[PDB]
Design a protein around this ligand. Structure first.
Ligand SMILES: C[C@H](CS)C(=O)N[C@@H](C(=O)O)c1ccc(F)cc1
Ligand SMILES: [Zn+2]
Ligand SMILES: [Zn+2]
Ligand SMILES: [Zn+2]
Length: 230
């Protein structure tokens, strides 16, 4: 069973193995009166691990590293943050202190700094234009256009047909718009179409928060945006 928000104490991280050499990591955090779950990704790259997003905060991210050591034993050597909010860069400084090389796009790095969030060290090149794709170790990084935020990236794992949508894709059980303070609500359905046109063969689709599904999460998310927008 995929771990749900009600089963993970704030401060603890679970790992869920999706495929061979592919896991999600799941944490929980208090935010704005509620507890929310949060997903990231872990992808094996031989004798090292590529981390996709922090576990939302310094303490959760240290827990993540401890859980990775317990359950996998391979070192995290690179990390990619998929947008500038705290559930994606909160913990970067812990990763850096632990010797992880932290990456984000130039936009994400700028927006993190503007906002006062932790800032990934290295800039990812080749992601400036909607539809750009880059092969980054075992994954493909993709910029679909502005949506949840103007900088959001998605991640695709070809070996396992895993599409990590981050917070530009909503789980089915969310039927209202959440955090749209930095969103391009008008562009968001267009960016979702772009993901669909590029990863039509996606089997396993991971939202930034909550339960994985399939490509039906894309259509579901547009409905939510439109319902909120119109
Ligand atoms: C703090 C974090 C940064 S994205 C955040 O605001 N998450 C937002 C959301 O993703 O819309 C969220 C709102 C309601 C939920 F049920 C789940 C997630
Ligand atoms: Zn190696
Ligand atoms: Zn966000
Ligand atoms: Zn989020």
């Amino acid at each position: 069973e995929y771990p749900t928000v009600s089963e993970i104490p704030v401060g603890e991280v679970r790992l869920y193995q999706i495929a061979d050499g592919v896991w999600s990591h799941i944490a929980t955090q208090s935010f704005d009166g509620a507890v929310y779950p949060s997903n990231g990704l872990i992808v094996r790259d031989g004798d090292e691990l590529l981390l996709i997003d922090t576990a939302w905060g310094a303490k959760n991210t240290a827990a993540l590293l401890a859980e990775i050591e317990k359950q996998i034993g391979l070192p995290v050597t690179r990390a990619v943050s998929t947008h500038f909010h705290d559930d994606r860069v909160g913990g970067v400084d812990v990763l850096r202190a632990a010797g992880v090389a932290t990456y984000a796009s130039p936009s994400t790095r700028r927006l993190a700094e503007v906002e006062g969030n932790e800032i990934p060290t290295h800039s990812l090149e080749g992601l400036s234009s909607s539809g750009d794709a880059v092969r980054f170790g075992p994954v493909e990084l993709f910029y679909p256009g502005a949506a949840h935020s103007t900088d959001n990236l998605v991640v695709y794992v070809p070996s396992a047909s895993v599409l990590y949508g981050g917070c530009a894709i909503y789980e089915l059980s969310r039927t209202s718009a959440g955090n749209v303070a930095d969103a391009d609500l008008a562009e968001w359905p267009t960016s979702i179409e772009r993901i669909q046109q590029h990863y039509p063969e996606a089997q396993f689709v991971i939202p930034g928060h909550g339960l994985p599904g399939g490509l039906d999460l894309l259509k579901h998310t547009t409905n939510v945006v439109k319902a909120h927008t119109n």
